Amino acid sequence: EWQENKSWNAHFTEHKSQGVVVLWNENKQQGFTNNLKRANQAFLPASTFKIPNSLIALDLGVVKDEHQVFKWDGQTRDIATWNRDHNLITAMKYSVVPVYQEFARQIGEARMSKMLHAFDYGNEDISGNVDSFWLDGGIRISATEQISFLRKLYHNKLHVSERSQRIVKQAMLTEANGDYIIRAKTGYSTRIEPKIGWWVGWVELDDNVWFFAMNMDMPTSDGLGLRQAITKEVLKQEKIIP
Ligand SMILES: O=C(O)c1cccc(-c2ccccc2O)c1
Ligand SMILES: [Cl-]
């Protein structure tokens, strides 16, 4: 069911890094990784939490739809794309933390906790501040646990409405061409050691879906582009994409 290929470590070590890639073949129900231990080690989800956070906000009516505008609060932040109005689509695309912090405040501790347990999401622990627990609180999730959660979402099996799941999968759209579609979300965790980057999602092909979840050491922001680049190079090596 699970195969470990330590030779794939070269994708990380050739960049003076270390990490894990996890792939799941939905048709064959088989998994692949370079490191079974790290595949099951739990990290802060950071901005990959925008997937469950969006689902909860939509299902509770905190967010009406993907067109509702979340007005910039007029506080100048150091990420230029955050200093503007957003909807769910662009908020996901630009990982706009302050918009999702307000989502969490309106969701509230009790409903957030209950929904994460319903999702079987990571350690389901929201200890910390309700508006930042996914950045510096107690919640943790592994690469394999991300795959499990994403598979439920793909099949509309999460305990929210079909509509909420369709909207979030629309907002996850990252790349599409004549050969494949990628729906995914990046993450960048810096507040608690070790600093890492995430990329989790899936690749849609004509007759199969390949789920993926990766994290990697990220001592500085200079390496953030390696999250997607390394993953796609693994996918290309395994003949999942051209
Ligand atoms: O991963 C991104 O594409 C992304 C999106 C938004 C912000 C940042 C970021 C980069 C450096 C330091 C802090 C950040 O919050 C990174
Ligand atoms: Cl779509």
Q: What is the DSSP string of the chain?
A: -EEE-GGGGHHHHTTT--EEEEEEETTTTEEEES-HHHHT--B--GGGGHHHHHHHHHHTTSS--TT--B---S---SSGGGSS-B-HHHHHHTT-HHHHHHHHHHH-HHHHHHHHHHHT-TT----S-TTTHHHHSS--B-HHHHHHHHHHHHTT-SSS-HHHHHHHHHHTEEEE-SS-EEEEEEEEE-SSSSPEEEEEEEEE-SS-EEEEEEEEE-SSGGGTTHHHHHHHHHHHHTTS--
227 labeled binding residue? yes
Strand order in the sheet with 173-176: 2-4, 30-33, 19-25, 209-217, 196-204, 181-189, 173-176
Going by alpha carbons, the residue nearest to atom 10 of ligand 1 is 221
Going from the Cα of 188 to the center of ligand 1, the distance in angstroms, rounded, reads: 7
Q: What would the two tokens of residue 37 be?
A: 């231990």
Comparing CA positions, the residue from 217, 218, 186 lying closest to residue 201 is 186
Give the fold, CATH level 3, of 1-242.
Beta-lactamase (3.40.710)
- Closest atom, ligand 1, to C-alpha of 197: 1
Going from the Cα of 5 to the center of ligand 1, the distance in angstroms, rounded, reads: 31
This structure's resolution (angstroms)?
2.0
Domain ranges of the chain: 1-242
Output the ligand 1 site: residues, CB below 6 A. Answer: 79, 94-95, 186, 188, 221, 224
Return d(Cα 5, Cα 221) in angstroms, integer. Answer: 28
Work out the angle between the directed axes of helices 162-171 and 143-154 (0-180°, nearest 10): 120
